[PDB]
Amino acid sequence: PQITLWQRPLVTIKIGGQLKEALLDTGADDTVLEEMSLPGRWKPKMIGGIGGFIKVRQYDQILIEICGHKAIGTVLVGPTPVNIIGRNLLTQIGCTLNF
Amino acid sequence: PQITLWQRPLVTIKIGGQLKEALLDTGADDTVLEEMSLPGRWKPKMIGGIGGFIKVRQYDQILIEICGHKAIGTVLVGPTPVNIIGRNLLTQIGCTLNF
Ligand SMILES: COC(O)c1ccc(CN2[C@H](COc3ccccc3)[C@H](O)[C@@H](O)[C@@H](COc3ccccc3)N(Cc3ccc(CO)cc3)S2(=O)=O)cc1
């Protein structure tokens, strides 16, 4: 579909059998989700943006469905105020910026 | 044009007669630039990122060229990691997300 930017680009995603609302963020290198439980081992990481840095847990090879499109990639889990779908996953669904 | 997301969506902008690099950010409601001098009076504003909130200076009706497209709108100036072009200006140049 074509998503206009008059409003925040929010979409429904499915991860771990859970449905969540996430923001399609072209400015984000990776994907970051609010605290939740995921299977497998993880590695600590620090990511920063406006306001500073936060500590997150890095999970690799996670399956996520974005608007019906399946994708696989790294997902960071931590105290983020909003669920963010970054470039690592946006490329997998063929998302492009157009003007 | 059509911009893929395998790499950061960095573009050249022109503001105050100078060329700078900026990130097309769909997750950002507003446009935030690194410390610089702009004309007129400014007002205060608090914006939130992944790490918390920061104080920035808000300048209105500022002329800015993005990839050759002329826009006139609100620009925020503060301690941001990189120059960010947000939805307020992406909508002016007719930018959309597609997949
Ligand atoms: C309630 O909460 C919100 O509404 C809420 C909404 C959106 C965000 C996301 N953020 C801004 C939005 O900025 C603005 C601008 C103007 C007005 C309001 C917000 C932006 O969209 C994002 O792309 C980037 C920008 O940061 C960087 C840092 C370094 C390099 C490049 C970009 N984010 C950080 C980030 C870093 C690393 C990873 C993982 O890789 C993922 C994400 S952010 O700063 O956090 C947070 C909270």
Q: What is the CATH number of the domain that holds A71?
A: 2.40.70.10
Amino acid at B33: L
- B48 with A51: Cβ contact below 8 A: yes
Sequence-separated (6 or more) residues with CB below 8 Å from residue B48: A50, A51, A81
List the domain range (segments joined by +) for residue B52: 1-99
> What CA–CA distance (Å, rounded) separates A93 from B98?
10
Q: How many residues does chain B have?
A: 99
Distance from CA of A10 to the nearest CA of B (A): 9
Q: How close is the Cα of B35 to the center of ligand 1, in Å?
A: 18
Neighbours of A6 (CB within 10 A): 9
For chain A, the domain total comes to 1
The closest alpha carbon to A28, from A94, A93, A98, A75, belongs to A75
The reply to whether B70 touches chain A by the CB within 8 Å rule is no
**Are B64 and B71 spatial neighbours (Cβ–Cβ below 8 Å)?**
yes
DSSP string of B6-50?
SS--EEEEEETTEEEEEEE-TT-SS-EE-S---SS--EEEEEE-S
- How does DSSP classify residue B87? H
Query: What is the SS3 assignment for B55?
Result: strand
Place of tokens 């996520």: A64
How far apart (Å, rounded) are the C-alpha atoms in residues A87 and A23? Answer: 12
Q: Which atom of ligand 1 is nearest to the CA of A82?
A: 2
Please enumerate in sequence order all residues whose Cβ is within 8 A of that of B96, keeping only pairs 6 or more positions apart, or say none. A2, A3, A4, A5, A97, A98, A99
Q: How was this structure obtained?
A: X-ray
**Cα(B64)–Cα(B74) distance, rounded to whole angstroms?**
10
Q: Annotated catalytic residue: which of A25, A29, A30, A60?
A: A25
Provide the residue count of chain A: 99
Best to test chain A binding among B26, B45, B85 (most A CBs inside 10 Å) = B26
Structure resolution in Å?
1.8
What is the SS3 string spanning chain A? CEECCCCCCEEEEEECCEEEEEEECCCCCCEEECCCCCCCCCEEEEEEECCEEEEEEEEEEEEEEECCEEEEEEEEECCCCCCEECHHHHHHHCCEEEC
